[PDB]
């Protein structure tokens, strides 16, 4: 997609191994990550992608901004599944990752895969949501881990973010039952999403 930098947050909580998507969900997500990266590159070469973790206590930068599927996949090929989501910590860090950029005209977008319910106070994430939006960071949730075993509390947060921004936040709902994770994401807006720009 034109002039856009999107950090993918991969979250490999302990609900990543759940075999709901064949063979396992973890391996389903590699296919998903390869899917998004090639599509956005071919469409626009100025699209760039970095890879960070949502898992572990403190996030890890595996990759910087790149138009290289090799660079992303090398870091992805070895990763832990016993880390755990800490969404609140992750949100503030993603912004910091985003300051360095191929060029500044590129937008600020996070796409985050979600494999587990929130692990943080609900009230805090609302406050963080509104800090992101001043600087025009919009956050698109591919949701499927929250609605496994908890109620959907994400809707509140997506509403809070949504303001005139470089891109808007989106709630795209993907059923956790078998359907193959990459396949839902190909049918969902990922490049049919839009902003207020």
């Amino acid at each position: 997609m034109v002039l856009e930098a999107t950090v993918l947050v991969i979250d490999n909580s302990e609900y990543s191994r759940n075999g709901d998507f064949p063979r396992t969900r973890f391996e389903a997500q590699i296919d998903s990550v390869e899917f998004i990266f090639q599509a956005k590159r071919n469409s626009n070469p100025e699209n760039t992608v970095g890879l960070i973790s949502g898992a572990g206590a403190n996030p890890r930068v595996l990759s910087t901004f790149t138009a290289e599927f090799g660079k992303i996949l090398a870091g992805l090929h070895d990763t832990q599944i016993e880390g755990k989501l800490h969404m609140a910590t992750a949100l503030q860090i993603a912004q910091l990752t985003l300051k360095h950029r191929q060029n500044k005209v590129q937008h600020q977008r996070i796409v985050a895969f979600v494999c587990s319910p929130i692990s943080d106070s609900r009230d805090e994430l609302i406050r963080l949501a509104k800090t992101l939006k001043k600087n025009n960071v919009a956050v698109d949730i591919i949701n499927f881990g929250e609605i496994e075993q908890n109620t959907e509390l994400l809707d509140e947060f997506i509403a809070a973010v949504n303001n005139p921004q470089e891109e808007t936040s989106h709630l795209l709902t993907v059923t956790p039952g078998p359907r193959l994770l990459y396949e839902n994401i190909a049918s969902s807006p990922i490049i049919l999403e839009e902003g207020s720009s």
């Binding site: 302990e14 609900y15 191994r17 759940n18 709901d20 070895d78 990763t79 599944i81």
Partner: protein, 388 residues
């Protein structure tokens, strides 16, 4: 097939234990491998008491292992052979599991990309060692522990549960050989680092607490009472029947009163056959304790024998000999003069930390601090002009 096994388990189970069984069938089906592990975990912790475990574990361990964390697989097997009073059975199931992990890692390592499987290795070997100790094949056990120790040091860090299981096996071997000092020392390490698993119950504290207390009572050098209290084992429970008499021995030592100590021990000599035969040790221990303490609190580092005679409640003939032994052990060091009937110490073991003693420390360093102050100001004035 598996469903038939689940139905048998439910029929024998209590209505209250029905929902745990029903959760295994649905979650497996739903391919929620997170809940598949959670439901199971609850079951093994407490329903290990019941024979329910035999049919559910072995089948699930031999079938659907791959899905859940490996750690969770070996945790259930541990629970099953706890209550098992058969050693043929125990040895069989271990050798079998070990073979299964070996296969498993060929796929799993690449699939996740990262996922340890060395956790299960060590625990298996720790269990096998122990099996041999109870079978009283002590020699096999010895060399397996040694090997684990070497392996372990190559790793920088392991889980709490891994070092707690190493320690547990080692502590068992030591009380078997009746190496009392080494049993107790390794038992301390066990308590600190303890598994977050809640297999350890109040009854399991009590079992461990009788041995720990016995080892230290018969000692003449074990003075880790302050650490003992603070450790979970005695922290939560003191108000059982085992901890009525046994804890009073313990208190009696600490206050250094021999009159009380004498009273309790006579009754305990009929009741306890360990204390019946180790009478000599119990009295020696209390003597050395009051003596090492009395010199410590005093800033004076020599005290006559005759005052020590009062302090330990033993005649002066016996005190002179005891003090010769104090040097040998190296609990005290000094010199012995019988041209004034004095003991002049030059070295005293650090005593246990107590609010009272700290208070003495605070004074001492305040006092010294005033000398320093007085001197530096006087020293400034003299030769004011030359400090180039």
């Amino acid at each position: 097939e598996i469903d038939t096994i689940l139905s048998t388990l439910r029929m024998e189970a209590d209505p209250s234990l029905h929902p745990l069984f029903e959760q295994f069938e649905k979650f497996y089906e739903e391919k929620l491998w997170f809940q598949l592990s959670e439901s199971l975990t609850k079951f093994f912790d407490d329903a290990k008491s019941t024979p329910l475990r035999l049919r559910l574990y072995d089948n699930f361990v031999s079938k659907f292992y791959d899905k859940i964390n490996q750690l969770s697989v070996v945790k259930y097997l541990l629970a099953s052979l706890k209550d098992s009073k058969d050693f043929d059975e125990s040895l069989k199931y271990l050798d079998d599991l070990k073979a299964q992990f070996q296969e498993l890692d060929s796929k799993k390592q690449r699939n996740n990309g990262s996922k340890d499987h060395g956790d299960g290795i060590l625990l298996i070997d720790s269990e096998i060692a122990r099996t041999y100790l109870l079978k009283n094949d002590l020699v096999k056990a010895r060399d397996l522990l040694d090997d684990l120790e070497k392996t372990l040091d190559k790793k920088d860090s392991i889980p709490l549960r891994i070092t707690n299981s190493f320690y547990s096996t080692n502590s068992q071997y030591f009380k078997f050989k009746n190496d009392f000092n080494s049993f107790y020392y390794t038992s301390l390490l066990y308590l600190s680092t303890l598994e977050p698993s809640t297999s350890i119950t109040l009854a399991e504290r009590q079992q461990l607490a009788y041995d720990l207390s016995i080892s230290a009572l018969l000692g003449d050098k074990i003075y880790n009472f302050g650490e003992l209290l603070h450790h979970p084992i005695m922290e939560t429970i003191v108000n059982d029947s085992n901890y009525d008499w046994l804890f009073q021995l313990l208190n009696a030592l600490t206050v250094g009163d021999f009159d009380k100590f004498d009273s309790l021990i006579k009754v305990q000599i009929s009741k306890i056959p360990i204390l019946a035969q180790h009478e000599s040790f119990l009295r020696q221990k209390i003597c050395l304790m009051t003596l090492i303490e009395t010199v410590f609190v005093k800033n004076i580092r020599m005290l006559s024998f005759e005052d020590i005679s009062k302090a330990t409640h033993l005649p002066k003939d016996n005190v002179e000999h005891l003090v010769m032994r104090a040097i040998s052990l190296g609990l005290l060091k000094g010199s012995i003069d019988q041209v004034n009937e004095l003991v002049t110490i030059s070295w005293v073991q650090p005593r246990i930390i107590s609010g009272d003693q700290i208070t003495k420390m605070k004074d001492r360093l305040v006092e010294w601090n005033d000398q320093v102050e007085k001197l530096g100001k006087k020293m400034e004035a003299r030769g004011q002009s030359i400090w180039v």
